[PDB]
Amino acid sequence: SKRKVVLAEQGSFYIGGRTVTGPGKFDPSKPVIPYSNEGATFYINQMYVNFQAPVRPRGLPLVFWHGGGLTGHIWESTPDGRPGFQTLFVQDRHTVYTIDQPGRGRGNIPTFNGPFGQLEEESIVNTVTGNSSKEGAWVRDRLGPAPGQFFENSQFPRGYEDNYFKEMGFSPSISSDEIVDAVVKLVTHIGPCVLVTHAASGVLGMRVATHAKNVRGIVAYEPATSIFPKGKVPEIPPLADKKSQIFPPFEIQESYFKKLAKIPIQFVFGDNIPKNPKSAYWFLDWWRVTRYAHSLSLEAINKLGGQASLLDLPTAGLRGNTAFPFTDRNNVQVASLLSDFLGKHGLDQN
Amino acid sequence: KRKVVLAEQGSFYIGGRTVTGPGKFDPSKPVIPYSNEGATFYINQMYVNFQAPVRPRGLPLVFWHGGGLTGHIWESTPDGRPGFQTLFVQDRHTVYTIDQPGRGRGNIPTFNGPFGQLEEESIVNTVTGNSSKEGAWVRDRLGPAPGQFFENSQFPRGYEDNYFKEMGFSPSISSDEIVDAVVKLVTHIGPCVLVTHAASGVLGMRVATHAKNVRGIVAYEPATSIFPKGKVPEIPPLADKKSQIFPPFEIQESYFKKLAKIPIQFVFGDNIPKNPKSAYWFLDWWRVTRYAHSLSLEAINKLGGQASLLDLPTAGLRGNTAFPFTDRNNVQVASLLSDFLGKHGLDQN
Ligand SMILES: COC(=O)c1sccc1S(=O)(=O)NC(=O)Nc1nc(C)nc(OC)n1
Numbered sequence: 001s002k003r004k005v006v007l008a009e010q011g012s013f014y015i016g017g018r019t020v021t022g023p024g025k026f027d028p029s030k031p032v033i034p035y036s037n038e039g040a041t042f043y044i045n046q047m048y049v050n051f052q053a054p055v056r057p058r059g060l061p062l063v064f065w066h067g068g069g070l071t072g073h074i075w076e077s078t079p080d081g082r083p084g085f086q087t088l089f090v091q092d093r094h095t096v097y098t099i100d101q102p103g104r105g106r107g108n109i110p111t112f113n114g115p116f117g118q119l120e121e122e123s124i125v126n127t128v129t130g131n132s133s134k135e136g137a138w139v140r141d142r143l144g145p146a147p148g149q150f151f152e153n154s155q156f157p158r159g160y161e162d163n164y165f166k167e168m169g170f171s172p173s174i175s176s177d178e179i180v181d182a183v184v185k186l187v188t189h190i191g192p193c194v195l196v197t198h199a200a201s202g203v204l205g206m207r208v209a210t211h212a213k214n215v216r217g218i219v220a221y222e223p224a225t226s227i228f229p230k231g232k233v234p235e236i237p238p239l240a241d242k243k244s245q246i247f248p249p250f251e252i253q254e255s256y257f258k259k260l261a262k263i264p265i266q267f268v269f270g271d272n273i274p275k276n277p278k279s280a281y282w283f284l285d286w287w288r289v290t291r292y293a294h295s296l297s298l299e300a301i302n303k304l305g306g307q308a309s310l311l312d313l314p315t316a317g318l319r320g321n322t323a324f325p326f327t328d329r330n331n332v333q334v335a336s337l338l339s340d341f342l343g344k345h346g347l348d349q350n
Numbered sequence: 351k352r353k354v355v356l357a358e359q360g361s362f363y364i365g366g367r368t369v370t371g372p373g374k375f376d377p378s379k380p381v382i383p384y385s386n387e388g389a390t391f392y393i394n395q396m397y398v399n400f401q402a403p404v405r406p407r408g409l410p411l412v413f414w415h416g417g418g419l420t421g422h423i424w425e426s427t428p429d430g431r432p433g434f435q436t437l438f439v440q441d442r443h444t445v446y447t448i449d450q451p452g453r454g455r456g457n458i459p460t461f462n463g464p465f466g467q468l469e470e471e472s473i474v475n476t477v478t479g480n481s482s483k484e485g486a487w488v489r490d491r492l493g494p495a496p497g498q499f500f501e502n503s504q505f506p507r508g509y510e511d512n513y514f515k516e517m518g519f520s521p522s523i524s525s526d527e528i529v530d531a532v533v534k535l536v537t538h539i540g541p542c543v544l545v546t547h548a549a550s551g552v553l554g555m556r557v558a559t560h561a562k563n564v565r566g567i568v569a570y571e572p573a574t575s576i577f578p579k580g581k582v583p584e585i586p587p588l589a590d591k592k593s594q595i596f597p598p599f600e601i602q603e604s605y606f607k608k609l610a611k612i613p614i615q616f617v618f619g620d621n622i623p624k625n626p627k628s629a630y631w632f633l634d635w636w637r638v639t640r641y642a643h644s645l646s647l648e649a650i651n652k653l654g655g656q657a658s659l660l661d662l663p664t665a666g667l668r669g670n671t672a673f674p675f676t677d678r679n680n681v682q683v684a685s686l687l688s689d690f691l692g693k694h695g696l697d698q699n
């Protein structure tokens with residue numbers, strides 16, 4: 001059965017985070033409810049981790065890291081209920097870790113007794129939130145140029161829009177340093193592994209690898225922020241509206257950037273990213289310039305002796321993918337290309 | 351034994367509604383920073399995970415976490431031993447675990463603006479509440495005060511950080527909308543058994559009154575009692591002679607009577623005092639809450655029901671906390687759940 005999965009073991013655990021404290025002392029004779037900050041210890045910014053291990057794994061464990069506003073659900077199942085990459089790669093004899101990063105899903109949302117995110121006089125995260133709409137996500141993920149529209153030959157699981165957009169939500173303003181820190185701790189716990197990232201976690205996975213030699217490879221689906229050595233960001237054009245820019249590239253010390261040259265790295269992009277300026281469709285143009293910036297980032301890694309590559313799925317014969325290729329209708333073929341990358345670098349061997 | 355063979359597994363979203371911002375969406379304008387303009391937001395949906403064994407027997411089980419928790423508590427214990435999800439797939443039941451609206455992978459309804467506010471509309475409150483480690487320690491009866499264990503405790507000592515890290519706040523989503531999501535899941539699944547915990551105790555009773563597909567309930571340490579409207583019995587205050595337990599939920603008698611048509615078991619752990627305990631607020635709270643539940647079960651049985659209270663010490667299990675299904679003896683706790691399922695024909699096809 002394509003759906004059957006045999007697990008030597010499965011489970012979940014929490015890792016990372018810190019504690020913060022309220023004032024005063026806790027008295028167990030006083031009413032505990034309504035909950036109070038008095039005498040309080042709060043665990044904040046911890047990460048949820050799920051693992052599924054096949055019988056007799058072959059090669060390195062994979063750590064699947066959801067994109068912005070998502071959770072590990074996107075690796076479990078597609079919106080129309082087909083197997084996600086978690087099942088596919090357990091079947092491919094890898095132990096599979098799926099995370100809900102701090103601030104998302106089963107990860108901690110740091111809030112207390114008081115306005116959201118505030119512990120007495122300390123703002124742990126902002127009370128004002130941000131969150132995409134269905135319409136924003138539709139064009140961000142390139143389902144089509146405008147909400148309700150689909151590109152010709154789309155691989156989106158059409159009809160399951162409600163399921164898809166229901167998986168998306170806000171992220172509190174946890175520092176990216178603390179998100180990276182949690183995953184570094186996971187990588188220390190797991191040992192040698194491969195990070196598989198998506199969108200917002202693209203740049204975060206690159207950062208983890210510079211802090212954790214156990215990261216032996218990276219596959220990044222549609223990364224949202226580019227990374228460069230400090231002071232060496234190339235010229236990147238504004239968008240076609242002559243006012244907007246892509247996400248400010250993340251800059252790291254060259255001593256850390258050079259660590260990215262020591263491992264195989266592949267960035268994967270779906271379809272319908274325009275080649276030419278598209279002033280009518282902001283997020284399509286955003287993707288054009290963002291993919292361009294990533295091509296320069298990978299070049300910089302390769303000029304330092306790296307093993308970085310850009311895979312456009314259409315060049316591999318796969319047409320119509322959205323920015324979530326691993327939950328599209330052809331996600332088995334997308335998984336096959338990930339299996340190819342792992343095999344090429346011996347990451348599927350013991 | 352950690353091995354598990356799954357005919358299939360996966361997850362999906364169910365339930366919820368939408369709310370909309372003002373104005374219209376223009377794809378030519380900058381989409382980031384995100385805006386409420388022209389926005390449709392999906393809110394209050396629920397996350398559902400399922401694992402199905404080869405050749406299932408009996409009814410699927412729906413495990414429903416307590417307050418401030420997620421489906422994690424059914425996956426593994428804080429010290430990494432198998433949770434009820436694995437144990438009951440091994441027992442050849444299909445197992446559903448949920449993250450209810452507002453918790454974990456369920457939706458937290460917030461937008462662009464102060465938390466929970468969509469323009470001038472308060473969808474959930476901006477001011478949150480959340481237990482501390484200290485409050486949860488005594489709530490769950492690890493011991494009488496933070497950092498202290500009962501001598502007989504079944505808690506997995508040394509894994510305190512892991513345990514408390516699984517808990518968090520819940521936004522002020524209406525209980526009606528949480529019950530609605532699970533009713534919709536139960537409609538989708540078909541005949542099933544609800545296994546609830548703490549805060550989800552009263553919610554699961556409510557679901558059963560709306561969903562004939564619920565064929566049985568096992569509730570671990572339920573936090574709020576339920577009675578027919580206007581028939582709440584005399585319940586004393588706590589030993590401090592000032593505090594009360596949670597106000598019992600009242601439902602119309604025509605709905606309450608549906609609880610008499612299925613087997614219902616409430617399960618309590620150890621170290622609930624028999625006598626007033628004014629020095630330890632949450633120990634005394636559990637004394638009076640357990641008493642209220644005993645009266646609620648009695649009311650169900652007076653309508654022809656089959657509602658029972660299982661005190662784990664009477665079954666030979668000593669020292670359980672208010673999370674018996676993640677304690678050190680959770681395999682023995684699971685055995686008693688399998689016994690209940692077997693007696694009532696819920697483990698046969
Ligand atoms: C599928 O492709 C994505 O999904 C994309 S594309 C751009 C973003 C995303 S994302 O994962 O949702 N969020 C992020 O990358 N995070 C993020 N969000 C905001 C509002 N600003 C900043 O930096 C200024 N970063």
Ligand SMILES: COC(=O)c1sccc1S(=O)(=O)NC(=O)Nc1nc(C)nc(OC)n1
Pocket residue numbers: 033034035416417418489490547548549550571573574596672673
């Ligand atoms: C282990 O036993 C529990 O875990 C208990 S005991 C009391 C509560 C819990 S709980 O699950 O955490 N929270 C709830 O039952 N929810 C809740 N919380 C508050 C502050 N007030 C109200 O009453 C409207 N309900």
